[PDB]
From a paper:
The viral peptides (HDAg‐L1pep and HDAg‐L2pep) bound at a similar site on NTD. However, in both cases only 2 consecutive hydrophobic side chains could be observed in the hydrophobic pocket (“IL” and “LL” in the cases of HDAg‐L1pep and HDAg‐L2pep, respectively). Interestingly, for both HDAg‐L1pep and HDAg‐L2pep the residues bound at the clathrin box do not match predictions based on alignments to the CBM consensus sequence, 18: in HDAg‐L1pep residues “ILFPA” occupy the positions corresponding to the LΦxΦ[DE], whereas in HDAg‐L2pep the residues “LLES”, including a C‐terminal serine residue that is non‐native and was added to the peptide to aid solubility, occupy the positions equivalent to the first 4 residues of the LΦxΦ[DE] consensus. The HDAg‐L2pep peptide could also be observed binding at the arrestin site, although the interaction was less extensive. The binding was largely similar to that observed for the cellular CBM peptides: the side chains of the 2 consecutive leucine residues bound at the hydrophobic cleft and their backbone atoms interacted with the side chain of Q192. In addition to binding at the clathrin and arrestin boxes, in 3 of the NTD:peptide co‐crystal structures solved (Amph4T1pep, HDAg‐L1pep and HDAg‐L2pep) a bound peptide could be observed lying across the interface between blades 6 and 7 of the NTD β‐propeller. In the co‐structure with Amph4T1pep a phenylalanine side chain projects deep into this pocket while in the HDAg‐L1pep and HDAg‐L2pep structures the side chains of a leucine residue and proline residue, respectively, bind less deeply. In all structures a hydrophobic side chain (leucine in Amph4T1pep and HDAg‐L2pep, isoleucine in HDAg‐L1pep) covers a surface hydrophobic patch formed by the hydrophobic portion of the R297 side chain and the hydrophobic faces of the peptide bonds between NTD residues 298‐300 on the surface of β‐propeller blade 6, and in all structures the backbone carbonyl oxygen of R297 forms a hydrogen bond with a backbone amide nitrogen of the bound peptide. Despite the similar molecular interactions made between the Royle box and the bound peptides, we note that the direction of the peptide chain differs between HDAg‐L1pep and Amph4T1pep/HDAg‐L2pep.
Residue numbers in the entry:
A (entry chain A): 4 to 363
B (entry chain E): 4 to 9
C (entry chain G): 2 to 7
D (entry chain I): 4 to 7
Write the structure that this text describes.
Amino acid sequence: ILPIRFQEHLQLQNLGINPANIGFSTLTMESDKFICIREKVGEQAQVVIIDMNDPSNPIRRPISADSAIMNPASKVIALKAGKTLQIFNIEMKSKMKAHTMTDDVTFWKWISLNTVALVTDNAVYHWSMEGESQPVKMFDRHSSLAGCQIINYRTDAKQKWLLLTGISAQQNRVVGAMQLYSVDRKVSQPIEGHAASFAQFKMEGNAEESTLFCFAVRGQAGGKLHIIEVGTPPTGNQPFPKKAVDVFFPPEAQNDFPVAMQISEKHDVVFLITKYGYIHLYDLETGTCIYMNRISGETIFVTAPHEATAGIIGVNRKGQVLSVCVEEENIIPYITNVLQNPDLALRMAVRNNLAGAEEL
Amino acid sequence: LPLLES
Amino acid sequence: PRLPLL
Amino acid sequence: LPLL
């Protein structure tokens, strides 16, 4: 019995998707609702939009964009070509917003239901879709990311802690460089890391939630995962004790590294996916490693939260759309019996209201 | 023109 | 439903 | 100094 439920939702090649377009620069998945793929048919570039609730009927539209990212919740698409940004409501056939930058956007992502983040060579911007807003600069990029491929950007729930992630090759390995920025302190901290996420977590005896920052890295020393509270605790809160644990890589995965993280706040569990398809689950509170296995033989290049199950969903280079979540009726007896860790089993059981710690 | 034709 | 690879 |  496994503490997780693993599924394949779709094979994109069965929808006529050319495997040459299944990759980081042409396939986007900003949430579990849509997958967008940029393709060429003849001379015409097009975007293929797969509604994950009706996947066998994709929508194709002509475009002349170098990047397409769908809103997390609605059929509203952001398109760019060099410095030109345009936002379209698809169903209304209408251009909601347009903006011309003065720098190319090397990476962009929806960070909420109504805000797009833009990364240029020099800085990170936020652009709200409300009213007549234009992009607002959040911070200047730190020199430690100079030359990196930018692979992710994310924030905490209140958008006070911002995290830009890049990778490059140093000494024949893929080295991650992160920039953690505090909006309130206007200070950046460079960190060696590969994949990360924020989470809200309410400690027992604390009246307010803590804001936690979790990151995984394969460093020179080995793989490590860290879970640390950012900011001053809310007034009246105990500080969250920081955690640091090993991230395991088997001998034959000598060039693997972490590429994705999502955190379930329903289960207080961290999902970590490596470049070469390994899945890890960690307890958010203690950092204890719950489970590792391999879910993909092909590299996984994009993930999102899987909202229905509070899991993680992703696409691999073959075009399999795969998800992993906590199997709620197995996770506790797995932890009790296979990990032989009643302490954790009991804690998770009462903390997240899961069955199975009636016998330990 | 428009980056998307609708 | 599916099984991991290891 | 540090954020973390």
